[PDB]
Amino acid sequence: SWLSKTAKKLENSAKKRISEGIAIAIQGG
């Protein structure tokens, strides 16, 4: 697959957005 495949790199960039909620948890998220 091209998308579903490249979705790994993308989705990955999201996996962070999750852990980011923590770094922002103090930012005033």
From Swiss-Prot:
Induction conditions: By bacterial infection.
Annotated keywords: Antibiotic, Antimicrobial, Secreted, Signal
Biological process terms in GO annotation: antibacterial humoral response; antimicrobial peptide secretion; defense response to bacterium
Tissues expressing the protein: Expressed in the body wall, intestine, uterus and ovary.
Main location as per UniProt: secreted
GO cellular component: extracellular region
Compartments where found: Secreted
The protein's role, per its UniProt record: Has antibacterial activity against several Gram-positive and Gram-negative bacteria. Is weakly active against yeasts. Acts by a nonpore mechanism.
UniProt record similarity statement: Belongs to the cecropin family.
UniProt name for this protein: Cecropin-P1
Organism: Ascaris suum
Upper lineage: Eukaryota, Metazoa, Ecdysozoa, Nematoda, Chromadorea
Residues included from the entire protein: 14 to 42 of 70
